[PDB]
């Protein structure tokens, strides 16, 4: 019982971490485009 509940919690944490991950990727690419504009 506990094993499965813990796995479900780990899945929810996975979901949150992925959300944060591609959010950070978006921020990265935004700053990167800004970097290229500043280089230009």
């Amino acid at each position: 019982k506990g094993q499965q509940e813990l796995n479900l919690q780990i899945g929810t944490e996975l979901n949150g971490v992925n959300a944060e991950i591609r959010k950070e990727t978006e921020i990265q690419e935004s700053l990167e485009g800004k970097n290229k504009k500043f280089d230009y």
Partner: peptide, 29 residues
């Protein structure tokens, strides 16, 4: 059950590290 729990935990850790590294890189940019 057990092994899937451990695998999910581990992968979650590595993706958290990826998140933290992306945060470092965004800050540095």
């Amino acid at each position: 059950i057990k092994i899937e729990i451990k695998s999910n935990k581990d992968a979650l850790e590595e993706r958290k590290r990826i998140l933290k590294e992306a945060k470092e890189e965004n800050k540095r940019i």
